[model samples]
Target chain A: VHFCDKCGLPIKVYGRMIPCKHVFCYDCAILHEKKGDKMCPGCSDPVQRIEQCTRGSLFMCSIVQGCKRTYLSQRDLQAHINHRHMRAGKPVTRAS
Target chain B: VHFCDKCGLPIKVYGRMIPCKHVFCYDCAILHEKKGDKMCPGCSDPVQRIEQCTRGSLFMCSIVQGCKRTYLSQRDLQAHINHRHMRAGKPVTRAS
Candidate 1:
């Protein structure tokens, strides 16, 4: 559910964590590993590999304002978009 | 200028930092402190006293995507808004 700090895209694959504890997308981390310059984009610290991404990981809301909600699932997110943004259908029901 | 993590608005005045190292706007932090909930909204950590925010504080870009520039001065930000966003006159010139 988290987004890669480097690519600004949702983390679809293994989001490798670095020494700074910030996570990057699989492709970005692999590219950095290939370049031998594994450092965190958020903080300029030498990075160490952690692990892949998982569900329930946190990412900032794409809507910077008027919505403070974060998503755990893509389906729920699309539902949010359709409901709150597009005014498409019924309001999303959170699992709570 | 940084935005308060709690309110999601530009940090206009003295942004107070809690032990979690996240800064909040003067009002939000003060209200929390007054309510005796000295915790960070981002991390939910029991916070300790820090200091007020300074001019060179860091904040996430209000523009969630395509632009990642953080501002230190209000004038530079206004210029950026007028240039990059409004497309009013000319492209904004960064201090570099």
Candidate 2:
């Protein structure tokens, strides 16, 4: 159950920090700053900016080489890399 | 066509560096050290260590919260995320 590291609550909306891209609840992230804390609770990295990851957006698959694929969900992204870009836990050689 | 940033050749085996997790060809990555180049060509991060991501391995889907799912291929992972973890690009409330 994706919980916000800072507030220990379920993540309703995703808040991601810049650079490290650690995940948090949107409200918890913003609330944390007003309380005089700026570092990410998930990691000790600077939270210079926070981005909202509202759903229905395409996520790029960079796990595989030369496969410019995108998906709307994380589950499908994992399965695609396993079947298309991999063979027995190894990346298949590219001919193109 | 995933080309080696240094040699400009097709990537046969995947060589990934830590920290930034940048990708490069296996041979070129080791060969690069012969000439005293130790940093990743794709990024300026230090190449502290390298890992071989051969195929047949499962990729974890962290895009969704608390799912704890893994997949054998990337293509299928994408589909699973679409059907299971999200709806219309927004993460559905997790009651399941």
Candidate 3:
């Protein structure tokens, strides 16, 4: 059993990001994925990889290169900012 | 018929990211996505969705991975950079 971050509701794992080490419902994760953010919910670790696209395209490891995190979409990224990156006494905006 | 950007091999529409307007075979996209390259392979658009996690609390997208877009959290911000903001022309250290 788990709890939702935003709503504070009881939640199980909807989706899981291997790098970011986060999990949420598929719909919840998808909702965040649509906007344009990629970071972990608990942390703001970006989901981008930093390796060359040996398989087909350019890529990077969020965890390895520097981010050391993951996310489902923008909202999750926002949450990361809200929780992780926020400066002392600074108010967090919805957008960065 | 599509061809792999890196390998120069033929590929099918394995996955699609709408905002980025990119299409690639599953193996290709999955490989890229796994690396945390959330942006569109063709354009490098950040993959993110904007909305509330009514059903749940926290989440984000890989598309927004490596994005300069930031929120407020200090640690989360670090996570974002590790995934999204670094580049080839501009080498990045661990932090800003």
Candidate 4:
């Protein structure tokens, strides 16, 4: 996991956003916004937008109980649970 | 082995020098000197001395005939060879 260059902290799930493609942890992002700094500290681009990542963007199934599956995206995990767990034949059990 | 940041070449035995402690290959140092760069690219200090390291600074006994000892300084290696290799009753054989 890449840490924020400014705050020197592991970027939490909610903290990953920057149009300049520079990753900053959430508190740093909010702090950056609050400080009203117009330029990105990394690329020196004008700060335009802060995007919120989808639910599964920065996490894994390891965080969820009984789900041994892993995914790089939240949408994939959601689809996995929907298709595999919600389906009739599959009994939901925690991964060993 | 650290490569020169400017020329991207492996620093040879004679290539290590810089008062700023920034490593640069010999060719890069000459090039920088030729270009008349007064300030060090790393620390932005005025370039002063290009001190040459002794024979043992950047190498190990692994490069020599059968010596298994390792040292970060040339002086240490020289001392080691003088003391160990020159001592009496020691059979001089290459390290396996």
Best by TM-score: 2
* Stretches of candidate 2 exceeding 4 Å from the true structure: A1-31, A34-44, A47-96, B55-96
Interface RMSD of 4: 28.3
Query: What TM-score do all the candidates reach, one by one?
Result: 0.32, 0.34, 0.25, 0.26
Question: For residues A22-67, could you state the per-residue lDDT of candidate 3 as single tens digits?
Answer: 4444455656667666865545567552211111221223322222
lDDT of 4 by residue, A13-93 (tens): 443334433334557666778888765543345767665543245321111112222333557556644543432222323
Ranking by TM-score: 2, 1, 4, 3
lDDT of 1 by residue, B1-96 (tens): 666556788867654454334445677777877888766544344767746655454432211212223333457555544433431112223322
**How far in Å is the alpha carbon of A29 misplaced in model 4?**
34
RMSD of each predicted structure: 18.2, 14.6, 17.1, 24.4
Q: Tell me the chain A TM-score of model 2.
A: 0.48
Q: What's the TM-score of chain A alone for every prediction? A: 0.42, 0.48, 0.40, 0.43
**Candidate 4: clashing pairs of residues:** A15-A26, A56-A74, B56-B74, B57-B74, B66-B94, B66-B95
Q: Candidate 4's residue-wise lDDT over B6-82, tens digit each?
A: 66766664433344343345676667778887654433447675554432444211111122223435575566455
Better of 3 and 4 by TM-score: 4
| lDDT of candidate 2 over B1-96, digit per residue (tens) | 567556788766766666445455678777776778776655345778767654233233223222323343567568755543332123323232
Q: Once superposed on the true structure, which residue ranges of model 4 sit more than 4 Å away at CA? A: A1-96, B14-19, B54-96
True contacts kept of each: 0.01, 0.01, 0.08, 0.00
For candidate 2 chain B, the 10 contiguous residues with the lowest summed lDDT are B60-69
Interface alpha-carbon RMSD, every candidate: 17.4, 16.0, 14.1, 28.3
Return the lDDT, model 3, position B72: 30
